[PDB]
Design a protein around this ligand. Structure first.
Ligand code: A1LWR
Ligand code: A1LWR
Ligand code: CO
Ligand code: CO
Lengths: 377, 377
């Protein structure tokens, strides 16, 4: 069931913004590790005396990395005279965020028809305001409401990246590409799922999309904006990884970003080649009992050779009634065991491909455990 | 002249420690960009609940990257019970440093015969204490005194990296190597050169080793520990880059690290290949008038082919009465126009090679300017 109850018109994920201590080093690491092109900037060299912001793109996926400069550089500025290209930016908020949580996501940005309307309707429906709608260069409108923890849901709307960003000159813009194409879903960890769901569904109208954690997925009308949320389950034998996150992150925040690849085998080969030379490490592969049991469950979908590819790369496979999901998880992106990335590819539900096709892999919790035991034998 | 007036016995540069917001991302970026191997760690996985520290090595060069975890992870600890592997580490000091200066060098570490003696003699001779000598695992002694700004001179002595660091398992330790072998000199920017010199020479006994800036070099008895210091010169037509540094860094700090390569041509080819794909950008090359005028000044030392190599790579050349210096400068290492790296190779003064052979390139200030004008023509 899909009541299509969005309170305003939502398009697609637009970008994810990381709040960093040094945006340069994080952006260069991510660029190399994920195969994303350096495509736009806003920093001292473009007249921004407030923050350094670097945009990486791969397909439709936009990763923005932002850090504050010395406040002394902009001490004479006021909000009407600011040289910041993102008017919601605040030195104190950014420094507090990063010292409290370490590296992680500040903003999940979705494009909407009308960001002013999206904000007012959201706030009228319980959203906690974070940054009021501001029209940039009479061309783009930006507004922010609290999502969970210190993460904000950012609305962006275009009359026709952002004003005051410059496109990067081609000599500095190496066209890296490992096959990642768009953001599939963005997942938050909170201490209590119930109140988090009620708040977010309450101001968006997003509907509930149909071990250590309880989880639920909120989705927009066409189910292309997918926002899962997790809570811990206490009292279990192994400690909840959601609780571990909350402890190391100092509370609620973004847990993982799932990135859709147009060729997850190519993506994972390219990423794994680079893990030890500046890129991203992947979680421990599951035992071969998992791949032995794969013929049975997805021999329908994947050939023996394509299943061989999965075992080499550590790809996990899940399947619901509609489609098939291939997935794998990176180790944490930074110092703390908090935010990680998921690489994703979905098979099925062709109409374009409908959103969430194949689910989110929760079948892989049981299959993994079972596979571990059958491997011990 | 070399009065050999060290007040304690100094060996070699031991390591440079960066204070970061996220040590993981900086270390992975530097590893890839400089060709340094990931060789040791101290973090959650080794029982350190206080800070994450990752060591990169290339030859004798040791770069350490450190960031604080959430203080809540170690809130029950006291200094006698600390799980920090570097006992001088302090959450508040590190967060203050990084939010004030951004990414940069906290510690210039030199190995000494006796770090307890080095500290006491230093403090008896005017050094401002920063961290008292602490003996780690009855094997290594560590102590710190203020150098300039919030940079400390760290003394390390070994009875026979540090206790509580683990060597990295080989699957995670890719043997990158672009030819960098050791730290040649480490340079500070201060507002006033005179008082800075008097302080540091005063507690070390280091002797003065024989445009926008005034500069002087302090050196140990065998002139292998080289600590140049710069001050700005105000009133010039172009603004002093030393003053720019002081403004963006919020005061005195480390300006550049000069890294000796056993093959600067190989190093720069390897680094330049990686600039746009996660590595380091280099400063704008000087005009061809510089390379045309190179035969005349160093045709003695470098063949036409080796001079061709210099023009391709942007290498600068200087020469004093004793030796020849090849050098090139990176763009800033992070968001702020503050700290950068210099790649270095020295030709001459064979005995081993005596320290500082060829000087530090100050002849290249005039040669560069001249070369610019002769290029305009
Ligand atoms: C997070 C996750 C997903 C997943 O993507 C997801 C959603 O997108 C919304 C629905 C709830 C959900 O779990 C799917 C399968 C999983 C899994 N995890 C946990 C995990 C794995 C690697 C690193 C950290 C963590 N961790 O700390 O939880 C796991 O073991 N299996 C088998
Ligand atoms: C720092 C420097 C050195 C140098 O290494 C050095 C020492 O090791 C101790 C003696 C004083 C000294 O200058 C040598 C030649 C130089 C130079 N600079 C400035 C520079 C260059 C690139 C990026 C930033 C800056 N900058 O901001 O100054 C320059 O133009 N030329 C020709
Ligand atoms: Co997921
Ligand atoms: Co130098």
């Amino acid at each position: 069931k899909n009541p299509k109850s969005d309170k305003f018109k939502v398009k697609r994920f637009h970008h994810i913004e990381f709040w960093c201590g040094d945006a340069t080093n994080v952006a260069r690491r991510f660029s190399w590790g994920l195969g994303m092109r350096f495509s736009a900037k806003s920093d001292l060299s473009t007249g921004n005396m407030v923050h350094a912001s670097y945009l990486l793109t791969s397909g439709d996926l936009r990763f923005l990395f932002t850090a504050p400069y010395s406040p002394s550089l902009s001490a004479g500025e006021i909000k009407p005279t600011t040289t910041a290209s993102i008017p919601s930016f605040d030195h104190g908020s950014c420094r507090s965020f990063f010292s409290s949580h370490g590296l992680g996501v500040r903003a999940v940005a979705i494009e909407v028809e009308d960001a002013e309307s999206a904000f007012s309707i959201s706030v009228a429906n319980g959203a906690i305001p974070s940054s009021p709608p501001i029209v940039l260069n009479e061309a783009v409108t930006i507004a922010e409401v609290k999502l969970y923890g210190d993460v904000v849901l950012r609305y962006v709307s275009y009359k026709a990246f952002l004003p005051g960003f410059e496109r990067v000159e081609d000599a500095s813009s190496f066209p890296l590409d490992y096959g990642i194409r768009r953001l599939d879903h963005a997942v938050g960890n909170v201490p209590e799922l119930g109140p988090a769901l009620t708040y977010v569904a309450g101001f968006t109208g997003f509907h509930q999309f149909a071990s250590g954690l309880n989880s639920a997925v909120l989705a927009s009308n066409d189910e292309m904006v997918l926002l899962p949320i997790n809570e811990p389950v206490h009292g279990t034998k192994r400690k909840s990884q959601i609780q571990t996150y909350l402890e190391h992150n100092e509370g609620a925040g973004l847990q993982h970003l799932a990135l859709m690849s147009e060729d997850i085998f190519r993506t994972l080969r390219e990423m794994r080649k680079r893990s030890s030379i500046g890129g991203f490490d992947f979680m421990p592969s599951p035992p071969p009992t998992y791949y032995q049991n794969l013929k049975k469950r997805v021999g329908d979908v994947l050939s023996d050779d394509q299943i061989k590819e999965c075992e080499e790369l550590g790809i996990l496979v899940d399947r619901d009634d509609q489609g098939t999901l291939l997935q794998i998880f990176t180790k944490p992106l930074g110092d703390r065991p908090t935010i990680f990335i998921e690489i994703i590819q979905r098979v099925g539900c062709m109409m374009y491909q409908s959103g969430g096709c194949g689910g989110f892999g929760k079948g892989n919790f049981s299959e993994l455990f079972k596979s571990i035991e059958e491997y011990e034998k």
